[model samples]
Target: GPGYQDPLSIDSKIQYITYTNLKAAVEKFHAKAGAAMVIDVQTGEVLSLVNYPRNRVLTDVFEPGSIMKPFTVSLALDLHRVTPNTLVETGNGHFVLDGAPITDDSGFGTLTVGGVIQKSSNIGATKIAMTMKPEEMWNMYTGIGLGQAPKVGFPGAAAGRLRPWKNWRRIEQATMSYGYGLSVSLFQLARAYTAIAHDGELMPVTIFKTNDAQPPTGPRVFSPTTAREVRTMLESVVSPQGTSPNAAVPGYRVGGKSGTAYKQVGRGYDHKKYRASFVGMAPMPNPRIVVAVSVDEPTTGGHFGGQVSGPVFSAIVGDTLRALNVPPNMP
Candidate 1:
């Protein structure tokens, strides 16, 4: 197929060219060992779906890492157990629960529930999870479709892998709270964030456009207020001094979370190798698109989500916003 150029405004032309190039790059770069899924938050259209390294993007289940935090926080916010201002005390860099050590990589002292998320502090997230019962936490996970197969109509979509809560151990609960001891596909992970993106509504994900007469509705996962609160917390992550300050885009408001998880090796988590990721939404006063980016096993320096995935996110948001003609937020 030949590429077409339209003699239109810069935004329209850029949108066309950006998507075209994105499609081509997905086929080129990720056609072997990576996969990506993107959607238009406004119209709920599937924009890109590409998989590499065996072409199993839809079928494969991988640990979602800190990307799961938004869901965890969503449940907390919905239950009225915590608010954006809830304070999580992380002292001396770690909090011990049931003998498992929860350490903050950034050595945070006192972080608001919002700050915990903005920093992706394991210590802070674990402390918050400790205040709630495992069953309550489990229900929240299941309620949001974490432990089960997501309802999104993708062929080969694996129901996420999770152990029954009845058999849960303290360490297991702690680990799972921060995205360990369970597995979910990239599509499923993206679907979880949809609730936060769409004002707490969990809609059925679609790969193809539906008939104009009928649209799919899945379920309402959160209230509009809760969804807006989550967005505010996410935006804090992009601000100066936020864990992902590098992720900020000038002239636009963006919010997102970063995740870094160790790769499993020889029956335990490997200390050296890690998977880094960042999931974000842009034009903050009004969100238009959600983007999730991952870089597997980056060998060079700076592998944390803030360092690696953050830049990719910035590029995508900058280009996407310009392409969509999204104006700067009113001060």
Candidate 2:
């Protein structure tokens, strides 16, 4: 407990997060807590990151839920173990792993690896997870900074938790595939998505500006080829055919995943308390920025990420894109 508190600074200044747009976004969402981030794809810079009540980007962690599906399928695609056309059965809508049941929203049939992510199929991810070794999956997760804080030298950052490879029981693996049995901050989620946005580079999270002479050289998490392919599939998730249809931006192209997870109550989970969130970027094949949004216990008329968090992501990305003078390519 030594040095629990930092010594006082005679003079201090606001840094990193101080965005009027983010403040407006939070107020419009009627959010109690939760937050959003706008990240620069090239420089790994935080353009705008905001959280209400508490700045969750640096601290709060939650089971990422279905947002992790794309990476699960992305890893399989990179390994040559599965193709986009590779079929994974949703198993008549019900699947069991070590006596734990994974269910779909209703009835979903057999799906391709891409479909699995587009539809956010938990059973499909579990079936896909079984195709890879535990070590391989852990590497994919950690490579993207899951189970670790992707801090920009910010204190109080939470790294979250990842079950050790030796302990990934069948249920744990199954749950982990669909973004449970583990935890991550939304900021970490943004960093992971950066790899997808930047042609598969796991860009570092930096609070300070990098020198102009030095171009960012992030660790490659997926091949550029693989990243492009995954980005195409993610785009579907914003379409009517995909799960988060409401996530689509007006004129510019957008792609992202919707996540909904139950809050913990006592030792179990609370059905009433939910975290609805979405993350996406725009302008098709490449993006200037990435926006991630999360809403805690949205008690209004709607609750799904596509309904709640998706629109927030859309507003932030679309407005930020327009403010940057990025033209709409669609005719």
- The candidate that wins on TM-score is 2
Clashing pairs in 2: none
Per-residue error at 95 for model 2, in Å? 1.5
**Which run of 10 residues does model 2 get worst, by summed lDDT?**
6-15
* Model 1, C-alpha of 297: deviation from truth (Å): 1.6
| TM-scores vs. true structure, each candidate | 0.84, 0.90
lDDT of 2 by residue, 153-192 (tens): 6778999999998888877878888998889998999889
Clashing pairs in 1: 32-52, 32-53, 33-53, 149-159
Q: What is the C-alpha RMSD of each candidate to the true structure, in Å?
A: 4.9, 5.8
In the range 297-330, model 1's lDDT, one tens digit per residue, is: 5554334322566766677677777766788773
For candidate 1, the per-residue lDDT at 76 reads: 77
Cα miss at 323, model 2 (Å)?
0.5
| Weakest lDDT window of 10 consecutive positions for candidate 1 | 1-10
**Global CA lDDT computed for model 2:** 0.79
